Amino acid sequence: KVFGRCELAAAMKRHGLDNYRGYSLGNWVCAAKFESNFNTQATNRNTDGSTDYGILQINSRWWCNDGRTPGSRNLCNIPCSALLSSDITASVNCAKKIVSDGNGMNAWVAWRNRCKGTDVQAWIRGCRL
Ligand SMILES: [Cl-]
Ligand SMILES: [Cl-]
Ligand SMILES: [Cl-]
Numbered sequence: 001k002v003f004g005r006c007e008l009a010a011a012m013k014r015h016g017l018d019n020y021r022g023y024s025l026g027n028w029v030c031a032a033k034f035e036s037n038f039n040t041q042a043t044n045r046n047t048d049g050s051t052d053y054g055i056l057q058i059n060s061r062w063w064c065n066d067g068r069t070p071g072s073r074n075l076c077n078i079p080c081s082a083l084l085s086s087d088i089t090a091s092v093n094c095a096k097k098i099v100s101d102g103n104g105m106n107a108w109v110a111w112r113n114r115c116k117g118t119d120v121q122a123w124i125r126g127c128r129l
Helices: 005-014 025-036 080-084 089-099 109-114 120-124
Strands: 043-045 051-053
Touching (some): 051 080
């Protein structure tokens, strides 16, 4: 599913991501924009052999099981395929664990490089929320 910008903002808020660990909704929408362009089916293969999955490009090295990332963990206790669903519940619940892991949203390199320090409220501007 490719979400609309406001549609995704609303879904993230519904699932309790708004201001989670102090990160406003615009931060999460911005991260999703640059990780996946709002496409739940996004996948990307990393140089280390792990894969990133879903709207927030959650990585199989630590967070989910895909059966093909040697020496990896599955800390969210989910198949990586669950992160590709039109229903963002699994992605949101896993993101909550990731952002609580110590480095906040810096876990998402694209958030650090493209969202951090910017006017992230622009991402939810105009949205009925
Ligand atoms: Cl915001
Ligand atoms: Cl594996
Ligand atoms: Cl980047």
